[PDB]
Ligand binder design. Structure first.
Ligand SMILES: Cc1nn(C)cc1-c1nc2c(-c3cnn(Cc4ccccc4)c3)c(Cl)cnc2[nH]1
Length: 252
């Protein structure tokens, strides 16, 4: 029986649609962790109880150095608390906008981290689907740790694949797309399909319309091209990515 006053709540780490996340310390052990607080009301209202059960049930039974651990859960009358591992070095999201953009070496590292983490998820038939820089956290060693399985399951739209947005059947190849989009954003500082309008982005994703800035190598260009295909099955397995020369050359 875990309950709210077993923890002391620190600065608010993230804000969210439904709930927030704070730094927290369990009193008995002095254990630092992140503590997601969700609001029953808003969840019921948007009817996502199932997806929360999913997230929890999925992230709870996952073991990998690049996947934010989920230690436990509990809830009171009004809210639900998710007890999570804490990422000292923050989010890649801020990391990017802070650094403007990433070199090929950092980029290719973060990708192999993801690809590893994703292989794993797929090796358990789990599609994250919602992979974006505000879901990628940095460990104390600066390692990438994916998180927020609020849209995870089994076999804004910038990071969604066409099949998804059009309302069609999808699979592990979803993450491959995201891996693509993500790789592009690291190098360029902006997602390939970004746009002022929703339905404008939709079109660009649907028609697959992107164009590399001058400063991206044929190598990078390559990977990204192979990775962003309208046809899910044209997209490389994760093994293929991991051994993509440009990644080999520069990953670490
Ligand atoms: C931000 C930030 N700066 N520094 C130095 C560390 C962090 C940090 N954030 C986290 C976080 C964290 C934050 N946001 N989110 C996602 C979210 C937020 C609000 C509602 C729903 C989902 C996770 C976590 Cl879980 C786990 N560890 C974290 N560490």
């Amino acid at each position: 029986q875990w309950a709210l006053e077993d923890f002391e709540i620190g600065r608010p780490l993230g804000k969210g649609k439904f709930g927030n996340v704070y730094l927290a310390r369990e009193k008995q052990s002095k254990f630092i962790l992140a503590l997601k607080v969700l609001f029953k009301a808003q969840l019921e209202k948007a009817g996502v109880e199932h997806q929360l059960r999913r997230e929890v049930e999925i992230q709870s039974h996952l073991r990998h150095p690049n996947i934010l651990r989920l230690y436990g859960y509990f809830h009171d009358a009004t809210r639900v608390y998710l007890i999570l591992e804490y990422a000292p070095l923050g989010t890649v999201y801020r990391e990017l906008q802070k650094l403007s953009k990433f070199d090929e070496q950092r980029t290719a590292t973060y990708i192999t981290e993801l690809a590893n983490a994703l292989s794993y998820c797929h090796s358990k038939r789990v599609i994250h689907r919602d992979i974006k820089p505000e879901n990628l956290l940095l460990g104390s060693a600066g390692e990438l740790k994916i998180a927020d399985f609020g849209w995870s399951v089994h076999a804004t739209l910038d990071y969604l694949p066409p099949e998804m947005i059009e309302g069609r059947m999808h699979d592990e190849k979803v993450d491959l797309w995201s891996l693509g989009v993500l790789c592009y954003e690291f190098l360029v500082g902006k997602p390939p399909f970004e746009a002022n309008t929703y339905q404008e982005t939709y079109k660009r994703i649907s028609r697959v319309e992107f164009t590399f800035p001058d400063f991206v190598t044929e190598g990078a260009r390559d990977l990204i091209s192979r990775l962003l295909k309208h046809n899910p099955s044209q997209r490389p397995m994760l093994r293929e990515v991991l051994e993509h020369p440009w990644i080999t050359a520069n990953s670490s």
